[PDB]
Coordinates of C-alpha atoms in Angstrom, one line a residue:
X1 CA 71.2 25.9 36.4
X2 CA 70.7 28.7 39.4
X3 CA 72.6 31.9 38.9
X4 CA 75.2 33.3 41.1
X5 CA 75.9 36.8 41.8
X6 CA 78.1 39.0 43.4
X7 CA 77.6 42.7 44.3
X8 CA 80.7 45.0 44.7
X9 CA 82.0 46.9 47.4
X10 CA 85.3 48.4 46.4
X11 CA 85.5 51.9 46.5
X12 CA 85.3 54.5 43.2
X13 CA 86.0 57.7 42.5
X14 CA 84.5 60.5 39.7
X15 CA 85.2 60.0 36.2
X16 CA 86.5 56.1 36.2
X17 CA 85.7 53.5 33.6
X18 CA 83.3 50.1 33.8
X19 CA 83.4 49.9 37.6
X20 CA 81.6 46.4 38.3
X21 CA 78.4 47.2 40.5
X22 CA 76.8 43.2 40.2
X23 CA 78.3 40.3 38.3
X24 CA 76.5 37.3 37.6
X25 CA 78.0 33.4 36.8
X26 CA 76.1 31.1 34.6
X27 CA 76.6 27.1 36.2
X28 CA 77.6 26.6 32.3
X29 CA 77.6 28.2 29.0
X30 CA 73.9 29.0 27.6
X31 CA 73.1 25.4 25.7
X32 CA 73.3 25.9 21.9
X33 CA 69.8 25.6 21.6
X34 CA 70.2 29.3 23.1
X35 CA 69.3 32.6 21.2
X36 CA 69.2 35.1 23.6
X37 CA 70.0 36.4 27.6
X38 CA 67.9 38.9 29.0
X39 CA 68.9 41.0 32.3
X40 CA 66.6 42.8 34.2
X41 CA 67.7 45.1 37.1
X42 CA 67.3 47.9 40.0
X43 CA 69.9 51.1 40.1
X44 CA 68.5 54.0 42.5
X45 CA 67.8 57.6 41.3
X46 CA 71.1 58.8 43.6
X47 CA 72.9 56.0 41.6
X48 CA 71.7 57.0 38.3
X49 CA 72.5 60.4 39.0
X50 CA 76.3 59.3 39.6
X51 CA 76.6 57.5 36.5
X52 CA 77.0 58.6 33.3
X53 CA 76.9 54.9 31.2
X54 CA 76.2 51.4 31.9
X55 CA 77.2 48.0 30.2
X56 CA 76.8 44.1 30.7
X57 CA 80.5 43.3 29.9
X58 CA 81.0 39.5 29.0
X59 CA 84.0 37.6 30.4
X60 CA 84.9 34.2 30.1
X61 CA 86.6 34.9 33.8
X62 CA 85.1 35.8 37.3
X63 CA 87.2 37.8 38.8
X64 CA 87.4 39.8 42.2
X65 CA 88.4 43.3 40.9
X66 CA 86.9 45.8 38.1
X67 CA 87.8 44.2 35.0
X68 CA 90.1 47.1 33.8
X69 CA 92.8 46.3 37.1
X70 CA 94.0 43.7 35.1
X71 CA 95.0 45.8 32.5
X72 CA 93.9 43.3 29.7
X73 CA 95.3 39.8 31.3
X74 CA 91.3 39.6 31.7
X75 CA 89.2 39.6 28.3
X76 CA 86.3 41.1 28.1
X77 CA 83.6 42.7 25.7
X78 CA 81.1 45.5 26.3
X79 CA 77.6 46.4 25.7
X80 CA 76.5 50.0 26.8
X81 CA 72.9 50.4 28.4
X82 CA 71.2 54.0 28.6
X83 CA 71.7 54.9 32.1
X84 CA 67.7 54.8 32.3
X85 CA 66.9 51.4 30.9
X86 CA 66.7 48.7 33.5
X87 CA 66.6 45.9 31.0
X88 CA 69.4 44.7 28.4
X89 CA 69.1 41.2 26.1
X90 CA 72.4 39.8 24.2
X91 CA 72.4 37.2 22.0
X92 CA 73.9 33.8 22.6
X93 CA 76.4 34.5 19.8
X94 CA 77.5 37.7 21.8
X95 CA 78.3 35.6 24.8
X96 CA 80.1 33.0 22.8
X97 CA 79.9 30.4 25.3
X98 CA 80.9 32.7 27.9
X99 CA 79.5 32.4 32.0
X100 CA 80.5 35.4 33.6
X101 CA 78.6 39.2 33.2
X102 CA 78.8 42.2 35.1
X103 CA 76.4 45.1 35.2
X104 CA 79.0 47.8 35.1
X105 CA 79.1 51.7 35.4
X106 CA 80.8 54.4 34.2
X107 CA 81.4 57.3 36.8
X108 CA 80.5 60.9 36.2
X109 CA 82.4 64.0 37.6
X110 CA 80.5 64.2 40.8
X111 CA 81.3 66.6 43.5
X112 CA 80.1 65.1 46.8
X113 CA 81.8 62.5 49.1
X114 CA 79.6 61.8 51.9
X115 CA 78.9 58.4 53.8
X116 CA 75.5 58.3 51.6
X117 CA 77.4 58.8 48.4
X118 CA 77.3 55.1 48.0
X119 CA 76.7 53.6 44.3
X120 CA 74.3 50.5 43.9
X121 CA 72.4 47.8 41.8
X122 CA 70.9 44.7 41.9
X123 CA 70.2 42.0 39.3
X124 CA 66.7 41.2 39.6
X125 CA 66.5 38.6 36.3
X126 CA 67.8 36.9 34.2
X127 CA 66.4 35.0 31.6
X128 CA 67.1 32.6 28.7
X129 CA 64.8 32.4 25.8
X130 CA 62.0 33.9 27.7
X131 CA 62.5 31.8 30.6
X132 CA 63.4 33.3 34.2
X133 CA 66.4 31.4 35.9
X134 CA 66.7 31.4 39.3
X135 CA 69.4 33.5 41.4
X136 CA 71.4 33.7 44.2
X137 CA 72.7 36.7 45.9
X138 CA 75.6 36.4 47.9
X139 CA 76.7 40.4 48.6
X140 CA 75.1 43.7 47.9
X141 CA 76.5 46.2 46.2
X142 CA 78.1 48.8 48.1
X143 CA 80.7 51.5 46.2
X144 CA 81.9 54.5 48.6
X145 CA 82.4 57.2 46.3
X146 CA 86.1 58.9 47.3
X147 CA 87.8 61.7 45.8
X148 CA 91.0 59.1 44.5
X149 CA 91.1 55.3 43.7
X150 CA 93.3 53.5 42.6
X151 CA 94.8 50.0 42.3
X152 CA 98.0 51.0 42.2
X153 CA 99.8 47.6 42.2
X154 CA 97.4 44.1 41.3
X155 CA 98.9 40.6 40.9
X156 CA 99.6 39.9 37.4
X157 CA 100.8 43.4 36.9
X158 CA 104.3 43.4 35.5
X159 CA 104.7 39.6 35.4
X160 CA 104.6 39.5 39.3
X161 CA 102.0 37.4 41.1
X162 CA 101.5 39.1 44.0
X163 CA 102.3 42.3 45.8
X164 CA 102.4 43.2 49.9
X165 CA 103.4 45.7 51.8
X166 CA 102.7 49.5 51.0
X167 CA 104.9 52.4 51.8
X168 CA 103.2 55.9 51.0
X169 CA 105.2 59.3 51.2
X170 CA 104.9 62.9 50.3
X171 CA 107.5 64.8 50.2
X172 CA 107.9 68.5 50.6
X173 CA 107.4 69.5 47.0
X174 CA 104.1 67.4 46.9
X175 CA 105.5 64.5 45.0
X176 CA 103.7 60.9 46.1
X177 CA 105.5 58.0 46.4
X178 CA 104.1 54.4 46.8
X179 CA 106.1 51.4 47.2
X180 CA 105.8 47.9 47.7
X181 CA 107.7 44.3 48.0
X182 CA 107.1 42.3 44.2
X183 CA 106.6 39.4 45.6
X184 CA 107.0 37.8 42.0
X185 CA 106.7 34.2 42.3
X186 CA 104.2 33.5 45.3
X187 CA 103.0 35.5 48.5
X188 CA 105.4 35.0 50.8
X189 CA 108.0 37.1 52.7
X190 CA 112.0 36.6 52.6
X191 CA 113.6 34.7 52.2
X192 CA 111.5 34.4 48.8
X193 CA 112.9 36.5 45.6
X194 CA 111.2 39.5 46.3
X195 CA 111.9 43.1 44.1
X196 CA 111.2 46.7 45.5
X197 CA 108.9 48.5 43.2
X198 CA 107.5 52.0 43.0
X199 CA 105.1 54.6 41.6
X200 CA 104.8 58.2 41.5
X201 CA 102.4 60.8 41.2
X202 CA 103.1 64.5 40.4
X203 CA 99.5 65.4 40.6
X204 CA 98.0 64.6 44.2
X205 CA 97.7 60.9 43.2
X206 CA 95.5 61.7 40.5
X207 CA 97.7 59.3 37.8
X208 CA 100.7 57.2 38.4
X209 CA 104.0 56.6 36.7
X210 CA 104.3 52.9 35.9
X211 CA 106.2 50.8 38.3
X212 CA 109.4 50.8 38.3
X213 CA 111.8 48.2 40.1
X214 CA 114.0 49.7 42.0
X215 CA 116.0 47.1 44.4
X216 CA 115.8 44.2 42.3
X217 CA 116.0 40.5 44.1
X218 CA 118.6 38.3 42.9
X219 CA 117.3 35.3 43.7
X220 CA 116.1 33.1 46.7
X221 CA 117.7 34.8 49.8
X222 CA 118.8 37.4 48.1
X223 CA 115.4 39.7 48.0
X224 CA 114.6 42.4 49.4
X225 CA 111.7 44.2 51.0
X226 CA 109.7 45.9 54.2
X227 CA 110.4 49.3 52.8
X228 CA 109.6 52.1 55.0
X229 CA 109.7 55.9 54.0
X230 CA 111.1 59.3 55.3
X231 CA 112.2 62.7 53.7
X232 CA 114.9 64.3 55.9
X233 CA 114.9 67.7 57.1
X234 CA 117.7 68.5 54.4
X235 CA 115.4 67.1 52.0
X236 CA 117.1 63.5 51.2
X237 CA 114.3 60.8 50.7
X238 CA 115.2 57.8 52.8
X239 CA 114.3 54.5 52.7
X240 CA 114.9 51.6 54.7
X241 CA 114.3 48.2 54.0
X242 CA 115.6 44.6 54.5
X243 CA 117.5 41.5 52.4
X244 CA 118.1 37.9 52.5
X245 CA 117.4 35.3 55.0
X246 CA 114.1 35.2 56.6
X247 CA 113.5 36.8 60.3
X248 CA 113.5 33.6 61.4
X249 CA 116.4 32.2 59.8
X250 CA 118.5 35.2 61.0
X251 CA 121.4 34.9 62.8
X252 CA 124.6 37.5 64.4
X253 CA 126.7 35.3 61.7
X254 CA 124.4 35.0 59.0
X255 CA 122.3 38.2 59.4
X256 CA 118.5 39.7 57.5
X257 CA 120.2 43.5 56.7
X258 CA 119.0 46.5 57.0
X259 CA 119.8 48.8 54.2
X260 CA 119.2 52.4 53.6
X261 CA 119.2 54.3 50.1
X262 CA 118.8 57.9 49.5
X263 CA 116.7 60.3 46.6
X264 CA 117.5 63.9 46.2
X265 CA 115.2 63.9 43.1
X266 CA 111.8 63.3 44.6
X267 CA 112.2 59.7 44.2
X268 CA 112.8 59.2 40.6
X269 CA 116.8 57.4 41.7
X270 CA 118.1 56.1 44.3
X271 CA 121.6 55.7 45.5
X272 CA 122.9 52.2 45.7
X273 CA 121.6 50.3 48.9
X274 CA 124.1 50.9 52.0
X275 CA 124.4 47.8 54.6
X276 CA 123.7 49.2 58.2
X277 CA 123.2 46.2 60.0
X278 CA 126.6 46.6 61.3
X279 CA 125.1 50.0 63.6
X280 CA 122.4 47.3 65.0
X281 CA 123.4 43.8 65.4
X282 CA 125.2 41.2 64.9
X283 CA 129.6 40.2 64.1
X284 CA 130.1 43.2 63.0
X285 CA 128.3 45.8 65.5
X286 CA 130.2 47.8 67.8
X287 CA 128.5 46.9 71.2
X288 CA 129.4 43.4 72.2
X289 CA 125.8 42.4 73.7
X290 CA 123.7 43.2 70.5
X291 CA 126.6 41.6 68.7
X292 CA 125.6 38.4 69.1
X293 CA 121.1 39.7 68.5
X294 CA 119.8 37.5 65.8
X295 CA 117.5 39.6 63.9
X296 CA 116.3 43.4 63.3
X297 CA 113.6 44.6 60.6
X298 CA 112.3 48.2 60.9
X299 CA 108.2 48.1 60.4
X300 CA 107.1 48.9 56.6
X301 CA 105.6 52.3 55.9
X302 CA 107.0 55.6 57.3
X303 CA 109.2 56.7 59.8
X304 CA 109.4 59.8 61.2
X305 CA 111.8 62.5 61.1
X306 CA 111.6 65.1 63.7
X307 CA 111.9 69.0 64.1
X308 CA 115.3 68.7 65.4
X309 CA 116.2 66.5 62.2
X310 CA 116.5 62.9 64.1
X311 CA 115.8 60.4 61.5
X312 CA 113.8 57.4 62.9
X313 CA 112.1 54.1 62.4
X314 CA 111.2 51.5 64.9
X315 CA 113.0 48.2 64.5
X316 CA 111.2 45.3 66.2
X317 CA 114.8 43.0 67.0
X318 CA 115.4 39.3 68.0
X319 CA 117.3 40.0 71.0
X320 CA 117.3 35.0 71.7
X321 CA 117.6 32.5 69.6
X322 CA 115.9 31.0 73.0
X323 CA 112.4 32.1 72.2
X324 CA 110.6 33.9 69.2
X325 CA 110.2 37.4 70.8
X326 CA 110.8 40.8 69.4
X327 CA 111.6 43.7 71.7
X328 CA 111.2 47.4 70.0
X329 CA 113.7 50.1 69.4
X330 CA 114.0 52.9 67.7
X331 CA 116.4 53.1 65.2
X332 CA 118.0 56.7 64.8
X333 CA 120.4 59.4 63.5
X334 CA 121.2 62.6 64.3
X335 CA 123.6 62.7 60.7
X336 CA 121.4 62.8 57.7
X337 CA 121.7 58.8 57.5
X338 CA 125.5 58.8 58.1
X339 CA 125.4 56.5 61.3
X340 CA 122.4 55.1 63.1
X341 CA 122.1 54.7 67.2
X342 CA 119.2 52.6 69.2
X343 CA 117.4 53.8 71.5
X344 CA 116.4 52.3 75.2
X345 CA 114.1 49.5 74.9
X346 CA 110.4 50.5 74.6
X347 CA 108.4 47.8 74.4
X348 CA 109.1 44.1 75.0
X349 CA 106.9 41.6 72.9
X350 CA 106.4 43.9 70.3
X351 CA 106.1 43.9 66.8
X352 CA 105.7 46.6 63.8
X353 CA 105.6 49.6 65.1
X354 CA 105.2 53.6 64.3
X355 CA 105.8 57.0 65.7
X356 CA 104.0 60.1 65.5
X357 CA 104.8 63.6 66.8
X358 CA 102.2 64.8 69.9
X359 CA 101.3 69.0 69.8
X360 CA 103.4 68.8 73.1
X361 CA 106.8 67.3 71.8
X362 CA 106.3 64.0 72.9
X363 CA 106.6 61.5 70.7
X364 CA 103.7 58.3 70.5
X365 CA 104.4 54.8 69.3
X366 CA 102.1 52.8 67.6
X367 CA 102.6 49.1 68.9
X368 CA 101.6 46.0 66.7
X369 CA 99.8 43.4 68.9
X370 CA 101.4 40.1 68.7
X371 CA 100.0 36.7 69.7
X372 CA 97.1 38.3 70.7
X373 CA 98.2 39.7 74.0
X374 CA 95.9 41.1 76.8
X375 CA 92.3 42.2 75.6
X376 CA 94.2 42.0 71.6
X377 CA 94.2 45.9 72.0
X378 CA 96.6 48.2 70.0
X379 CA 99.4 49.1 72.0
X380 CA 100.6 52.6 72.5
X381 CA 103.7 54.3 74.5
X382 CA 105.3 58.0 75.3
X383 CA 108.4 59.5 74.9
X384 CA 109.3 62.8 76.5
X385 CA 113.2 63.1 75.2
X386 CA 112.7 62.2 71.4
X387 CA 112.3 58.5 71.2
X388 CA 115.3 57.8 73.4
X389 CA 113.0 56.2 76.1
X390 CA 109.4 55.0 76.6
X391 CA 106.8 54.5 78.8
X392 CA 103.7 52.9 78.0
X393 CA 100.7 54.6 77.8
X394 CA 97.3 52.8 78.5
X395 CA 95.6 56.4 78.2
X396 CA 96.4 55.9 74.3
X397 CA 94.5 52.3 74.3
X398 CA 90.9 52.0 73.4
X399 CA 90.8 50.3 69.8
X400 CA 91.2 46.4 68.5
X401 CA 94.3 45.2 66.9
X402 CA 93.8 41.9 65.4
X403 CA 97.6 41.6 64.8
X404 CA 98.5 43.9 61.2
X405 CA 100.4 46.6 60.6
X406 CA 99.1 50.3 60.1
X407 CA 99.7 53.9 60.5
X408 CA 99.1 57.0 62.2
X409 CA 98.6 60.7 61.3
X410 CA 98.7 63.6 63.4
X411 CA 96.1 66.1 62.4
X412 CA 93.9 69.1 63.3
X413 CA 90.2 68.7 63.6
X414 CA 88.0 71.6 64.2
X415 CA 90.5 73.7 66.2
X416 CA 91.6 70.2 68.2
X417 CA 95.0 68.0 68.2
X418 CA 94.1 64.1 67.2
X419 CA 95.3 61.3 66.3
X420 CA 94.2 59.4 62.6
X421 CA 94.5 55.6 63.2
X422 CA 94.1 52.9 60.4
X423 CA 93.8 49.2 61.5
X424 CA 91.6 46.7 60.2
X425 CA 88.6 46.8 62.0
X426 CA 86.9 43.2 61.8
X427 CA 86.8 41.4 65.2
X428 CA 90.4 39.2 65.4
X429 CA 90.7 39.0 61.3
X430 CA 92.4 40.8 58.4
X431 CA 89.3 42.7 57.2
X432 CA 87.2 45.9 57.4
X433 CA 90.2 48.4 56.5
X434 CA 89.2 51.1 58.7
X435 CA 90.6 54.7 60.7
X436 CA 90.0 56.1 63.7
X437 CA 90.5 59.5 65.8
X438 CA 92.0 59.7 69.3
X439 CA 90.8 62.7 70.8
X440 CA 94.2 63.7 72.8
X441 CA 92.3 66.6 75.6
X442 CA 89.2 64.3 75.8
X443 CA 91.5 61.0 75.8
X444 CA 88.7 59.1 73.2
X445 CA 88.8 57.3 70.0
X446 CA 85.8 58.2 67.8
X447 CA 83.7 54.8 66.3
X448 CA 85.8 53.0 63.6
X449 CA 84.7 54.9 60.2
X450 CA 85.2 51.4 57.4
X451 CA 87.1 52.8 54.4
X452 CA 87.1 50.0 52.8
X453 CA 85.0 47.1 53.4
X454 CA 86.4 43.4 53.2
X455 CA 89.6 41.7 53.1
X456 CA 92.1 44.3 54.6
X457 CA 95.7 44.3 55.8
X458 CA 98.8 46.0 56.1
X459 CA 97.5 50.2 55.7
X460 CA 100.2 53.0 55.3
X461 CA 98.9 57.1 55.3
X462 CA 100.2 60.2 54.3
X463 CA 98.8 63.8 55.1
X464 CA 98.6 65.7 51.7
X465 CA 99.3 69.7 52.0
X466 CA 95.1 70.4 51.8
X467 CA 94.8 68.0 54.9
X468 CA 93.7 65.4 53.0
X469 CA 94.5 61.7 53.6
X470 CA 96.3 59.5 50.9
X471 CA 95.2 56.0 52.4
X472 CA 97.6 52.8 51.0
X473 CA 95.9 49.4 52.0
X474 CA 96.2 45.8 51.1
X475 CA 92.4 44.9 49.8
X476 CA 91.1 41.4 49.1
X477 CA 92.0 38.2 49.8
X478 CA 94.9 38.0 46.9
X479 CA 96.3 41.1 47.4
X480 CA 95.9 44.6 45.7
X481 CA 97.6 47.8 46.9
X482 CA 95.2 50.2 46.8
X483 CA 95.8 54.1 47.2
X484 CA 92.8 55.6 48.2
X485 CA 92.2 60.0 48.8
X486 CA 89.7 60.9 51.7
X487 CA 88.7 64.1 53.5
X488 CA 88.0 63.6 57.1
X489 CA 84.8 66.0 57.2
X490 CA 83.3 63.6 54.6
X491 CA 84.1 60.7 57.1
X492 CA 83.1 61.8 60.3
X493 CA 80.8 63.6 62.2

């Protein structure tokens, strides 16, 4: 007969509907006897302030997100509270046999985005008939308030069980694109039927067209996914992406491909996907060595396309079928797409990695740490002659890397070039999804600044034209991709 409760921690943003601050679980349905549930509960002035509505909604599920992610695949009903009360009774009728309520919000149009613009509550009763039941609290609510959230892709959304994988890009015009790998009938990577699906925003990634697949899987082995994003210089949207067999499972005979496929309306179609695997690996590359390299993927997210108008990505490529290494190189051309070169080497027992352009010209890469090398730092390296060769640069190293994927963002910050990490942050786990700054003159990364709190993985980031950050992260444990608009003075200090 205790009560279990939950307080939220996911972020919000101004004017959004029934965000979940605490919900509750009943062991069981109230016993028929029943007539009537009481709540009684704490909300701060600086809450209350933020709010503009609350409500007990009713569900006959618990589930991890605010009920409206799920876009009606969870039931619910509501029962608005005046924003000053701090009790609220339903009948047993109203519940209908149902176990699960959350005190729930609805968000004003507020204009401040601090660290301390955090929403919260706490249930402090519950009673049946008069009679207190006990309670256990398991987390406190927490809600960042940010200037953009969104879920933009949540299992059960469009019959598909699961998404991974986010690819944000802006292009030129100011259109947002977000991507990710429908991973339609369980979690897991190729070679698993797995679709391409975007969104789009025309507004700053204030609202989202609906997703749309847009390199559909045919089947087991014949998915696709790991989709990484560029615009070229002559204003082509590129992606890159892979299909088929699993990295594993690849061979020079039987290859994973790389394709490419090109937009010249902000993203809205996309040519038919070109095989380039040939430029890279395996029976039918050129070069007789890499012809008989196993496996190539390019890391999911962005590439980067420099001044010049060199086109790259870095491919992390199974060089043995001896061993279960990958060696990094980046993957480039000089011809709007037409044919793609490697680069030397630059780092051996790599994994994902990323690129950024230095104020100087040099170019930085963002090395995944795999198998937890050394002190399970981040790896970084330099280029001096646009991402031909590398050097490793320890100057660079400084922040945890408990093995994910993420991004970098070159930006300006108070008259001073750094460098906008996102990692999660959690000692040696997927959670904490958090950024950093890497001051480049005074060679130090700032304290991790949490974003988002929890379960976190894979993180892509775009800079929007204000110098604002659009943030793309996997959050929970069953995976939502979640787009997410900051501003760094708000963050840091």
């Amino acid at each position: 007969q205790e009560v279990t409760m939950w307080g939220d921690s996911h972020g919000v943003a101004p004017n959004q509907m029934y965000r979940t601050l605490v919900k509750v679980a009943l062991s069981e349905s109230l016993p028929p006897d029943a007539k009537q549930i009481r709540i009684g509960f704490s909300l701060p002035k600086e809450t209350e302030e933020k709010v503009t509505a609350l409500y007990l909604l009713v569900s006959d599920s618990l589930a991890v997100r605010d009920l409206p992610d799920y876009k009606g695949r969870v039931s619910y009903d509501s029962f608005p509270i005046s924003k000053e009360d701090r009790t609220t009774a339903l009948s047993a009728d109203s519940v209908a046999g149902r176990r699960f309520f959350y005190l729930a919000a609805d968000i004003g149009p507020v204009a401040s985005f601090s660290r301390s613009d955090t929403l919260t509550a706490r249930v402090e009763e519950l009673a049946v008939d008069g009679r207190p039941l006990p309670l256990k609290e398991l987390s406190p609510a927490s809600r960042r308030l940010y200037r953009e959230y969104e879920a933009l892709f949540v299992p059960g959304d469009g019959g598909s069980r699961n998404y991974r994988i986010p690819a944000i890009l802006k292009t030129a015009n100011g259109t947002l694109i977000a991507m990710a790998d429908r991973r339609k009938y369980n979690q897991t990577d190729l070679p698993e039927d797995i679709d391409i699906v975007m969104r789009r925003s025309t507004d700053g990634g204030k609202s989202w067209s609906d997703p749309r697949i847009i390199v559909q899987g045919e089947g087991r082995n014949h998915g696709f996914g790991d989709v990484a994003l560029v615009q070229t210089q002559a204003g082509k949207l590129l992606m890159i992406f892979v299909g088929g067999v699993g990295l594993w499972q690849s061979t020079p005979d039987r290859p994973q491909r790389t394709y490419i496929s090109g937009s010249r309306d902000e993203g809205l179609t996309w040519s038919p996907p070109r095989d380039i695997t040939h430029f890279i690996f395996g029976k039918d590359c050129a070069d007789p060595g890499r012809s008989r390299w196993l496996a190539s993927f390019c890391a999911s997210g962005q590439g980067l396309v420099l001044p010049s108008g060199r086109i790259m990505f870095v491919a992390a490529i199974r060089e043995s079928g001896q061993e279960y290494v990958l060696n990094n190189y980046v993957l480039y051309s000089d011809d709007e797409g037409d044919t793609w070169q490697l680069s030397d080497c630059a780092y051996r027992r790599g994994d994902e990695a990323k690129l950024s352009l230095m104020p100087d010209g040099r170019v930085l890469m963002s090395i995944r740490n795999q198998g937890r090398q050394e002190s399970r730092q981040r790896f970084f390296a330099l280029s001096s002659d646009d991402g031909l060769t590398w050097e490793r640069a320890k100057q660079f190293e400084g922040i945890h890397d408990p093995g994910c994927n993420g991004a970098m963002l070159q930006v300006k910050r108070n008259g001073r070039d750094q460098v906008l990490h996102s990692l999660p942050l959690g000692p040696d786990g997927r959670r904490d999804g958090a950024v950093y700054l890497f001051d480049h003159t005074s060679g130090r990364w700032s304290a991790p600044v949490v974003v988002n709190s929890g379960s976190s993985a894979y993180s892509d980031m775009t800079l929007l034209a204000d110098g604002t950050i659009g943030y793309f992260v996997e959050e929970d444990d069953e995976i939502s991709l979640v787009f997410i608009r900051f501003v760094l003075d708000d963050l840091f200090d």
